[PDB]
Design an enzyme around this catalytic site. Structure first.
Site, PDB file in Angstrom:
ATOM      1  N   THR A 138       1.687   4.310  -4.412  1.00  0.00           N
ATOM      2  CA  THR A 138       2.687   4.300  -5.469  1.00  0.00           C
ATOM      3  C   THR A 138       3.980   3.543  -5.200  1.00  0.00           C
ATOM      4  O   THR A 138       4.427   3.414  -4.053  1.00  0.00           O
ATOM      5  CB  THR A 138       3.062   5.768  -5.840  1.00  0.00           C
ATOM      6  N   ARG A 139       4.569   3.067  -6.292  1.00  0.00           N
ATOM      7  CA  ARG A 139       5.824   2.337  -6.267  1.00  0.00           C
ATOM      8  C   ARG A 139       6.682   2.730  -7.467  1.00  0.00           C
ATOM      9  O   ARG A 139       6.200   2.875  -8.588  1.00  0.00           O
ATOM     10  CB  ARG A 139       5.594   0.814  -6.335  1.00  0.00           C
TER      11      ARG A 139
ATOM     12  N   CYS B 184       4.410   0.651   6.464  1.00  0.00           N
ATOM     13  CA  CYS B 184       4.445  -0.551   5.656  1.00  0.00           C
ATOM     14  C   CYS B 184       5.672  -1.396   6.027  1.00  0.00           C
ATOM     15  O   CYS B 184       6.474  -0.985   6.878  1.00  0.00           O
ATOM     16  CB  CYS B 184       4.369  -0.073   4.197  1.00  0.00           C
TER      17      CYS B 184
ATOM     18  N   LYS C 198       5.700  12.589  -2.061  1.00  0.00           N
ATOM     19  CA  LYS C 198       5.777  11.488  -1.110  1.00  0.00           C
ATOM     20  C   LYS C 198       7.248  11.139  -0.900  1.00  0.00           C
ATOM     21  O   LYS C 198       8.013  11.017  -1.881  1.00  0.00           O
ATOM     22  CB  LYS C 198       5.011  10.278  -1.673  1.00  0.00           C
TER      23      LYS C 198
ATOM     24  N   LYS D 217       8.185  -3.605  -8.194  1.00  0.00           N
ATOM     25  CA  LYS D 217       8.356  -3.359  -9.634  1.00  0.00           C
ATOM     26  C   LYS D 217       8.518  -4.656 -10.430  1.00  0.00           C
ATOM     27  O   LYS D 217       8.251  -4.687 -11.628  1.00  0.00           O
ATOM     28  CB  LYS D 217       9.595  -2.473  -9.903  1.00  0.00           C
TER      29      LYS D 217
ATOM     30  N   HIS E  29       0.810  -1.207   0.000  1.00  0.00           N
ATOM     31  CA  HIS E  29       0.000   0.000   0.000  1.00  0.00           C
ATOM     32  C   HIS E  29       0.852   1.270   0.000  1.00  0.00           C
ATOM     33  O   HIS E  29       2.078   1.224  -0.111  1.00  0.00           O
ATOM     34  CB  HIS E  29      -0.959  -0.003   1.194  1.00  0.00           C
TER      35      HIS E  29
ATOM     36  N   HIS F 275      14.818   4.851   3.093  1.00  0.00           N
ATOM     37  CA  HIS F 275      15.057   3.440   2.759  1.00  0.00           C
ATOM     38  C   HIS F 275      15.986   2.565   3.625  1.00  0.00           C
ATOM     39  O   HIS F 275      15.681   1.402   3.907  1.00  0.00           O
ATOM     40  CB  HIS F 275      15.555   3.397   1.316  1.00  0.00           C
TER      41      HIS F 275
HETATM   42  C1  FAD Z   1       6.835  -1.090   2.382  1.00  0.00           C
HETATM   43  C2  FAD Z   1       7.427  -0.453   1.263  1.00  0.00           C
HETATM   44  C3  FAD Z   1       7.831  -1.310   0.278  1.00  0.00           C
HETATM   45  C4  FAD Z   1       8.268  -0.804  -0.961  1.00  0.00           C
HETATM   46  C5  FAD Z   1       8.241   0.623  -1.188  1.00  0.00           C
HETATM   47  C6  FAD Z   1       7.840   1.514  -0.132  1.00  0.00           C
HETATM   48  C7  FAD Z   1       7.447   0.996   1.104  1.00  0.00           C
HETATM   49  C8  FAD Z   1       7.045   1.934   2.222  1.00  0.00           C
HETATM   50  N1  FAD Z   1       8.553   1.198  -2.392  1.00  0.00           N
HETATM   51  C9  FAD Z   1       8.901   0.292  -3.386  1.00  0.00           C
HETATM   52  C10 FAD Z   1       9.137   0.865  -4.638  1.00  0.00           C
HETATM   53  O1  FAD Z   1       9.030   2.079  -4.884  1.00  0.00           O
HETATM   54  N2  FAD Z   1       9.511  -0.057  -5.674  1.00  0.00           N
HETATM   55  C11 FAD Z   1       9.646  -1.440  -5.539  1.00  0.00           C
HETATM   56  O2  FAD Z   1       9.969  -2.154  -6.481  1.00  0.00           O
HETATM   57  N3  FAD Z   1       9.380  -1.933  -4.301  1.00  0.00           N
HETATM   58  C12 FAD Z   1       9.022  -1.109  -3.293  1.00  0.00           C
HETATM   59  N4  FAD Z   1       8.695  -1.661  -2.038  1.00  0.00           N
HETATM   60  C13 FAD Z   1       8.870  -3.185  -1.843  1.00  0.00           C
HETATM   61  C14 FAD Z   1       7.651  -3.946  -2.369  1.00  0.00           C
HETATM   62  O3  FAD Z   1       6.405  -3.224  -1.986  1.00  0.00           O
HETATM   63  C15 FAD Z   1       7.709  -5.300  -1.608  1.00  0.00           C
HETATM   64  O4  FAD Z   1       8.908  -5.979  -1.912  1.00  0.00           O
HETATM   65  C16 FAD Z   1       6.395  -6.189  -2.144  1.00  0.00           C
HETATM   66  O5  FAD Z   1       5.187  -5.582  -1.951  1.00  0.00           O
HETATM   67  C17 FAD Z   1       6.633  -7.549  -1.582  1.00  0.00           C
HETATM   68  O6  FAD Z   1       5.464  -8.326  -2.046  1.00  0.00           O
HETATM   69  P1  FAD Z   1       4.920  -9.679  -1.367  1.00  0.00           P
HETATM   70  O7  FAD Z   1       3.915 -10.211  -2.243  1.00  0.00           O
HETATM   71  O8  FAD Z   1       6.054 -10.400  -0.810  1.00  0.00           O
HETATM   72  O9  FAD Z   1       4.221  -9.034   0.026  1.00  0.00           O
HETATM   73  P2  FAD Z   1       2.630  -8.526   0.167  1.00  0.00           P
HETATM   74  O10 FAD Z   1       2.312  -7.702  -0.986  1.00  0.00           O
HETATM   75  O11 FAD Z   1       2.671  -7.999   1.558  1.00  0.00           O
HETATM   76  O12 FAD Z   1       1.835  -9.846   0.125  1.00  0.00           O
HETATM   77  C18 FAD Z   1       1.860 -10.915   1.127  1.00  0.00           C
HETATM   78  C19 FAD Z   1       0.442 -11.307   1.326  1.00  0.00           C
HETATM   79  O13 FAD Z   1       0.320 -12.575   1.991  1.00  0.00           O
HETATM   80  C20 FAD Z   1      -0.657 -12.532   3.001  1.00  0.00           C
HETATM   81  N5  FAD Z   1      -0.511 -13.437   4.098  1.00  0.00           N
HETATM   82  C21 FAD Z   1       0.415 -13.362   5.092  1.00  0.00           C
HETATM   83  N6  FAD Z   1       0.372 -14.363   5.909  1.00  0.00           N
HETATM   84  C22 FAD Z   1      -0.639 -15.151   5.441  1.00  0.00           C
HETATM   85  C23 FAD Z   1      -1.205 -16.387   5.867  1.00  0.00           C
HETATM   86  N7  FAD Z   1      -0.751 -17.046   6.948  1.00  0.00           N
HETATM   87  N8  FAD Z   1      -2.243 -16.937   5.157  1.00  0.00           N
HETATM   88  C24 FAD Z   1      -2.709 -16.280   4.063  1.00  0.00           C
HETATM   89  N9  FAD Z   1      -2.222 -15.081   3.583  1.00  0.00           N
HETATM   90  C25 FAD Z   1      -1.182 -14.586   4.337  1.00  0.00           C
HETATM   91  C26 FAD Z   1      -0.911 -11.018   3.343  1.00  0.00           C
HETATM   92  O14 FAD Z   1      -2.208 -10.662   3.839  1.00  0.00           O
HETATM   93  C27 FAD Z   1      -0.428 -10.289   2.103  1.00  0.00           C
HETATM   94  O15 FAD Z   1      -1.561  -9.874   1.337  1.00  0.00           O
HETATM   95  O1  PYC Z   2      12.954  -0.485  -5.133  1.00  0.00           O
HETATM   96  C1  PYC Z   2      12.659   0.711  -5.249  1.00  0.00           C
HETATM   97  O2  PYC Z   2      12.707   1.327  -6.350  1.00  0.00           O
HETATM   98  C2  PYC Z   2      12.244   1.382  -4.061  1.00  0.00           C
HETATM   99  C3  PYC Z   2      11.840   2.657  -3.789  1.00  0.00           C
HETATM  100  C4  PYC Z   2      11.558   2.696  -2.439  1.00  0.00           C
HETATM  101  C5  PYC Z   2      11.799   1.440  -1.888  1.00  0.00           C
HETATM  102  N1  PYC Z   2      12.203   0.682  -2.885  1.00  0.00           N
END
Ligand code: FAD
Ligand code: PYC
Ligand code: CL
EC number: 1.5.3.1
Length: 385
Positions: A48-49, A315, A265, A348, A45, A269
């Site tokens: 944006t990414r 997050c 925003k 990404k 959430h 990091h």
């Molecule tokens: C946090 C963050 C990350 C981030 C970013 C800025 C912030 C503040 N900016 C990014 C950016 O500009 N560019 C980029 O490439 N990456 C950036 N990131 C990192 C990226 O958001 C994370 O690496 C990515 O979202 C990781 O994805 P993943 O699929 O691993 O994680 P998720 O989206 O959280 O999904 C996990 C899901 O699984 C569920 N869950 C958890 N436990 C269970 C169980 N037991 N049973 C069923 N489901 C489960 C969760 O609810 C979740 O939906």
């Molecule tokens: O992987 C990225 O581009 C990024 C931006 C903020 C956190 N990760």
């Protein structure tokens, strides 16, 4: 009484992309999530990414970045939800003092990526609103941009479901039963079986992979972001202010231009609080560093974007020891696929990863070179219980 071809545990960034890729191929898929994606409890959430192609974390990620970019353009054409805006991405840092900037430059050269190199005042002149010292240099990637992450997950979900994929929400998977020819998951709402399993639980991978007899160092981090009232004549996407990831003496920061006036925003990091996904405090502002580390960067480098805090989000990043991902088959079960430890930079690649997970679950192989993400690499320090 309902077997599936493939079960995906955790339907977030990686899982929902995999679900879409599988459903698109007529594979009967079940996606199970602890909440209702897209949501604000995981790692996707904050609206944006950034997507970058010339990759500072390592030139070896370029092919996957480019393939994901093409997949994002495909998604844009398939849904009514907004997917990508080509803001371009600016990367800068003190000359000769940033491995991140240096590798970004090498990655661009090695892969013939289109980039502009500039330094000192040229940066401040090109983008009014940025004030860097004269000894700073930069590399700008015009065709990189910004993904609307929640929209991507929502789009992938609507498209996968339209094709028969089932999504069981608000259901936490608590245990796994893996056999040589099938997989089974246990939840309070019931148990389910399939021929293949994809595990993509995000931060929860750090707590539940032990249920798969895996012992991999994974550390969740609390990472906040803030939206600030800014000088729109300078920081608006409309006047081409770019997305950015930069390195300064005290760390790496990243940010996005103000879209439709919602404000610039910013995120810090390289620093975050070590936390547990089930006890993390998701309220922005409870630690004084949440807002202060951000304004410390803005007053110095982007002073016109240091206004009233309009919004904050909390997050999580899930780091591996070497900060590279884990995308591979479970070492003891070829019918189980693992996607974990995206270490703060995986969104990404989620479109590209959905494709890789799909291939791994259906064929046990992938056309992509994913050796750098091996679950057996030594730097990872992986082992079985
Ligand atoms: C946090 C963050 C990350 C981030 C970013 C800025 C912030 C503040 N900016 C990014 C950016 O500009 N560019 C980029 O490439 N990456 C950036 N990131 C990192 C990226 O958001 C994370 O690496 C990515 O979202 C990781 O994805 P993943 O699929 O691993 O994680 P998720 O989206 O959280 O999904 C996990 C899901 O699984 C569920 N869950 C958890 N436990 C269970 C169980 N037991 N049973 C069923 N489901 C489960 C969760 O609810 C979740 O939906
Ligand atoms: O992987 C990225 O581009 C990024 C931006 C903020 C956190 N990760
Ligand atoms: Cl992450």
């Amino acid at each position: 009484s309902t077997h599936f071809d493939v079960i995906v545990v955790g339907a977030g960034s990686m899982g929902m992309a995999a679900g879409y890729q599988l459903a698109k191929q007529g594979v009967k898929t079940l996606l199970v999530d602890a909440f209702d994606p897209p949501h604000t409890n995981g790692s996707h959430h904050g609206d944006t990414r950034i997507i970058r192609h010339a990759y500072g974390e390592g030139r070896e990620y370029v092919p996957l970045a480019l393939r994901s970019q093409e997949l994002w353009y495909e998604l844009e054409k398939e849904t009514h939800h907004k997917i990508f805006t080509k803001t371009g991405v600016l990367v800068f840092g003190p000359k000769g003092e940033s491995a991140f900037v240096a590798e970004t430059m090498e990655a661009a050269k090695e892969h013939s990526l289109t980039v502009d190199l500039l330094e000192g005042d040229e940066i401040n002149k090109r983008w009014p609103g940025i004030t860097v010292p004269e000894n700073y240099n930069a590399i700008f990637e015009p065709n990189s941009g910004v993904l609307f992450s929640e929209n991507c997950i929502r789009a992938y979900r609507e498209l996968a479901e339209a094709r028969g994929a089932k999504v069981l929400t608000h259901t936490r998977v608590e245990d796994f039963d893996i056999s040589p020819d099938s997989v089974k998951i246990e939840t309070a709402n019931g148990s389910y079986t399939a021929d293949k399993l994809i595990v993509s639980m995000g931060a929860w991978n750090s707590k539940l992979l032990s249920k798969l007899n895996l012992d991999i160092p994974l550390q969740p981090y609390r990472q906040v972001v803030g939206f600030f009232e800014s000088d729109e004549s300078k920081y608006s996407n409309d006047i081409d202010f770019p997305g950015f990831m930069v390195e300064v003496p005290n760390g790496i920061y990243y940010g996005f231009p103000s879209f439709g006036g919602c404000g610039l925003k910013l995120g810090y990091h390289t620093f975050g609080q070590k936390i547990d996904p089930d006890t993390i405090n998701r309220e922005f502002g409870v630690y004084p560093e949440d807002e202060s580390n951000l304004r410390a960067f803005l007053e110095e480098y982007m002073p016109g974007a240091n206004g009233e805090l309009k919004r904050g989000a909390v997050c999580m990043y899930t780091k591996t020891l070497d900060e590279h991902f884990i995308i591979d088959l479970h070492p003891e079960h070829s019918n189980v696929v693992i996607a974990a430890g995206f270490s703060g930079h995986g969104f990404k690649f989620s479109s590209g990863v959905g494709e890789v997970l799909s291939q791994l679950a259906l064929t046990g192989k992938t056309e992509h070179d994913i050796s750098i993400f091996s679950i057996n690499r030594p730097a990872l320090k992986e082992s079985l219980q």
